[PDB]
Ligand binder design. Structure first.
Ligand SMILES: Cc1ncc(COP(=O)(O)O)c(C=O)c1O
Ligand SMILES: Cc1ncc(COP(=O)(O)O)c(C=O)c1O
Lengths: 389, 381
């Protein structure tokens, strides 16, 4: 159903018909405080007025670095990049270079950007251990040093380290899977990853492009009490300004895009991380928004006797209509979901003034602008939609 | 040198010192720093929604402006960086032709992606440009010397049937400024067209810089794909690749609304200034003449190549490639000169192969001041 945006503010889109739509997708993750956040955008505009890109060292560099180090426990030094994809590629090159090894371990459904060595077919994928290129025109050996396992399968993971631990440069992982449903790690799973990588000499890389500053102030790292060797950040960090980073403790960081680290980007980081740092109860409040939305949506689906799957970590949340007839991975979750009907539901909800992505595996990203009154409206819209389904 | 702020052609240091910048952040700032037309537009988009990940009215306006100004571009795909646009262009070529081999030229830089990142021995050696790349990263990548038609003809005679693409900075602007030898771009166009290989112009630097329609327009040779960035977005992070409909048969930030706004404001501005490239040419000429005079007056040999406002200046101890140019340059003394010029209030990059990028804010009076500063520097050398 065609939706062309004219403007956006808070949790609202205005389309080109001047229709207004409550947005549950929120641009895929960066907008913790909603669209058109003035504290952030005043700072970024100000930096445009004062020089946004000189390619030279700037006072802001040390401030953005210090705020990330402060809020993210496992980060002490950071290198900036222009995207998540770039930060991932650099982190993985660092791990290969640092360990003298080539193999990188991924999990099925986990998405780490479009770079040549990690771009796998995810949802478009056969078995979880098959490594299938995610785009046409990649070189034949693109993935020849990349391996894949099912998310939350400790036995396969132990087997792989027993066989090949000596060859593994890194394990990269969305600590909470947020690109193929929202699927938290099974209990002990992150700790097992940390133990196996530590024992083998492999670097553990948390891709926190989504989870960072979202599931807790210090990300999944802080929330689950497991510290990786490298952390990739983006999205919330810059408030939706294109910027990203990777970092780690000094030991891990011992060893390039021209836009990487430009002044407006770092200003956005300073304003966004500054704003978060000044709101010590922010994550308790986000948690309450998340809870209220989850309860509301559940009630509406239970009331229309439509089975639904909902996983939530804070304001990160997947909502999926189930077939008329706890998943630990993408295969298990996808097998339960009624994709066609969920698309139909999305069409209907959009007509009622609520936008979520039509693919039931694309999560919702709530913000402080999703107030109790906004959520009550979403409920009415969803109920009106379900009745029409 | 740590920057506090910048405006026009000026930097302010954390000591509140003022410095005329000849580097200008490596290419995007055709009108200088803090261009208010472009600022005002980008700030305005922040106030109205900078990223929803959804189709926006701006999408069609940015696309149309690029298709208007760049002859060989009819459809375009946006990206967050030059690196990403290059990677996508090359994947499109490999996929479209069913081939894998990509041809690059020594010294030519196309970003950091796995299949093109070469170290900037012989010009035909393909050396990885970063540690930690996979062993086969460059196994489908070949390299020739810039401006060597014989080697190029030999390669197509032997392997033309296997080549998915040739990628090229149509003017080399990452290793000196070394234009194509006369007829070289035409040869590339002919050899690629005959072999079924795609010709990819990396115009990240040259786009909207050496001419309104880029090197394509300036040299009258149209590639199958074009990569754009830098000037296109005014230094907002954004890039694109595109081509004719025939040839054209995403990073989450790719195509966000503030980026496309910056493109609309910048390309709109350039579209309104039909003599802009004539005026940039006059700035370039005046700088080149000025610098030549100062060096000749101190009897210091210097090499200067210029295409419009793109220009390399190198103290010496016509080169057609990097090897020939580097052999002539006195790198240590050029670094020393840079130190001295910086104390005099003029910044250029200390490596003599890093070019200068002039802007409409480098006025005649700015250039006269640069001349004084460079003379006071040379005398100190
Ligand atoms: C000719 C050329 N191509 C491609 C790129 C890559 O662009 P980015 O640094 O935005 O990835 C650059 C960067 O300077 C460049 O100068
Ligand atoms: C977990 C994760 N890692 C990496 C990326 C890549 O980020 P970018 O699109 O900025 O290259 C994404 C994009 O959504 C992501 O969700």
């Amino acid at each position: 159903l065609p939706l062309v945006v004219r403007s956006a503010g808070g949790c609202l889109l205005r389309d080109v018909e001047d229709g207004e739509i409550i947005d549950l997708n929120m641009g895929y993750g960066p907008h913790l405080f909603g669209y058109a956040d003035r504290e952030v955008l005043d700072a970024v505009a100000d930096q445009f007025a004062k020089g946004h890109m000189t390619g030279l060292p700037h006072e802001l560099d040390a401030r953005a670095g210090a705020l990330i180090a402060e809020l993210v426990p496992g980060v002490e030094q950071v290198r900036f990049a222009n995207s998540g994809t770039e930060a991932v590629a650099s982190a993985l090159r660092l791990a290969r270079a640092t360990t003298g090894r080539t193999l990188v371990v991924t999990f099925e459904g986990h998405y780490h950007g479009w770079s040549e060595t990690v771009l796998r077919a995810g949802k478009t994928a056969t078995r979880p251990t098959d490594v299938v290129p995610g785009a046409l025109g990649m070189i034949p050996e693109a993935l020849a040093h990349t391996v894949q396992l099912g998310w939350n399968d400790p036995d396969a993971l132990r087997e792989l380290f027993a066989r090949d631990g000596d060859r593994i440069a890194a394990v990269i992982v969305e600590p909470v899977l947020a690109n193929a449903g929202v699927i938290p790690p099974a209990p002990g799973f992150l700790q097992l990853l940390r133990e196996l990588t530590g024992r083998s000499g492999a670097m553990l890389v948390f891709d926190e492009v989504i989870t960072g500053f979202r599931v807790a102030r210090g990300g999944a790292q802080e929330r689950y009490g497991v510290e990786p060797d490298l952390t990739v950040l983006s999205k919330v960090m810059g408030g939706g300004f294109p910027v990203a980073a990777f970092g780690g403790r000094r030991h891990a960081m011992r060893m390039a895009g021209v836009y990487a680290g430009n002044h407006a980007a770092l200003r956005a980081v300073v304003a966004m991380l500054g704003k978060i740092r000044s709101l010590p109860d922010l994550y308790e409040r986000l948690e309450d928004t998340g809870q209220y939305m989850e309860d509301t949506v559940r009630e509406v689906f239970a009331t229309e006797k439509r089975p639904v799957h909902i996983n939530r970590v804070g304001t990160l949340m997947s909502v999926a209509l189930l077939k008329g007839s706890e998943p630990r991975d993408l295969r298990q979750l996808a097998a339960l979901v009624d994709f066609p009907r969920h698309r139909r539901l999305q069409t209907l909800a959009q007509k009622e003034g609520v936008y979520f992505h039509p693919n039931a595996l694309e999560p919702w990203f709530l913000s402080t602008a999703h107030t109790r009154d906004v959520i009550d409206k979403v409920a009415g819209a969803l109920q009106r939609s379900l009745v029409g389904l």
